[PDB]
């Protein structure tokens, strides 16, 4: 009787389809893994390269049938170190790392809307440690902790993590996603703490797909900058008054202004 | 009985994928198989960096079962390979 109970309640559970049980005994199936992987299978190029943590390396190549960079079987640890450094830096260094590997998409599992334990924020510290193992001069573990010495997502978190790429990648446009149940506007059901950076914007990425319960998020690595721009506003001195002009334009009156125009 | 007759954990997907290759290309193609769709800039020599015991058994049972005109898909063989072998484990 014990063996039958243990097999029924404990070890017979798939990790592909998640089952959330209603109160009346009805079971709902969160099927977001296969949804995102099937999109990735039928809405990308045939030779697209996805970047993911090593855990799902197999599952993408089996389900989604796309070229992964780092697999589940680990036989080259500096490749995983490169992927970890890309997943735990700001957008500029991570974008250089992603350009030198010819990556196209970036896949991150975010389990914050529903109460899913293992997402990539819960597996972020191992990324930091693996990337520290091979690049001690660039990534410091202690840098992603608060000056008290703990790992948190609030306003008290470190500004070295609040601009990381995993953080900016798995929390994009989440500071406006408020559940119908009365709770703060931004709230993480796993890390029961209100996010500190409500508004984040990308510079080299763009959102490509986001599953129904926001479980799996796929971003697209854009092309390089079309042209370089000045870092500063053009030169303005105080010798002559600027006298900036006012817009003077409606949806009906579309007529511009010229200083040196002969009047009638 | 619940959900669906599909594969579950992270590891069995690679076993499945290489077994599918062994079904659609034979044995001497799986022994020389140079997967370029994994570890992208490097490529993974699958035939020479894997243990071909699960794949060969699944492919052999698939071939025997399809020679007798019992048309079973190879994902069903990969799903139901383990209980059948549990019986043999009891005998052993």
């Amino acid at each position: 009787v014990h063996c039958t109970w243990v097999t029924s309640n404990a070890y017979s559970s798939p990790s592909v389809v998640l089952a959330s049980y209603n109160h009346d005994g009805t079971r709902n199936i969160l099927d977001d893994f296969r949804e995102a992987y099937f999109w990735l299978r039928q809405n990308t190029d045939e030779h697209a390269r996805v970047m993911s943590w090593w855990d799902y390396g197999y599952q993408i190549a089996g389900m989604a049938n796309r070229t992964t960079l780092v697999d589940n079987n680990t036989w080259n640890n500096s490749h995983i170190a490169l992927v970890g450094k890309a997943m735990s830096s700001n957008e500029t260094a991570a974008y250089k790392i992603m350009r030198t590997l010819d990556v196209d998409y970036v896949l991150v599992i975010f389990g914050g809307v529903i109460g899913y334990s293992g997402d990539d924020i819960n597996k972020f510290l191992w990324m930091v440690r693996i990337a520290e193992g091979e690049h001690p001069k660039d990534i410091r573990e202690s840098d992603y902790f608060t000056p008290q010495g703990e790992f948190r997502v609030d306003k008290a978190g470190s500004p070295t993590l609040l601009n990381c790429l995993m953080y900016k990648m798995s929390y994009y446009r989440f500071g406006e996603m408020q559940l119908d149940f009365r709770t703060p506007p931004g709230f993480d059901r796993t890390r029961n703490a209100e996010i500190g950076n409500k508004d984040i914007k990308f510079k080299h990425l763009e959102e490509a797909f986001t599953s129904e319960h926001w479980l799996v998020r796929i971003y697209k690595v854009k092309a390089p900058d079309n042209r370089e721009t000045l870092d500063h506003k053009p030169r303005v001195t105080n010798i002559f008054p600027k006298q900036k002009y006012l817009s003077k334009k409606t949806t009906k009156r579309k007529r511009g202004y010229i200083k040196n125009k002969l009047v009638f | 009985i619940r959900f669906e007759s599909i594969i579950h954990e992270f590891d069995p997907w690679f076993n499945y994928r290489s077994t599918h290759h062994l079904a659609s290309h034979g044995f001497y193609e799986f022994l020389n198989w140079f997967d370029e769709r994994a570890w992208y800039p490097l490529g993974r020599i699958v035939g020479g960096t894997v243990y071909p015991g699960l794949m060969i058994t699944a492919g052999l049972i698939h071939w025997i079962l399809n020679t007798l005109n019992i048309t079973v898909h190879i994902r069903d063989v990969c799903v139901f390979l383990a209980p059948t072998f549990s019986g043999l484990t009891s005998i052993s």
Binding site: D55, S117, G118, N122, K123 | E9, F10, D11
Partner: peptide, 7 residues
């Protein structure tokens, strides 16, 4: 008990 990172 799988081949994932310990969360």
């Amino acid at each position: 008990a799988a081949n994932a990172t310990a969360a």
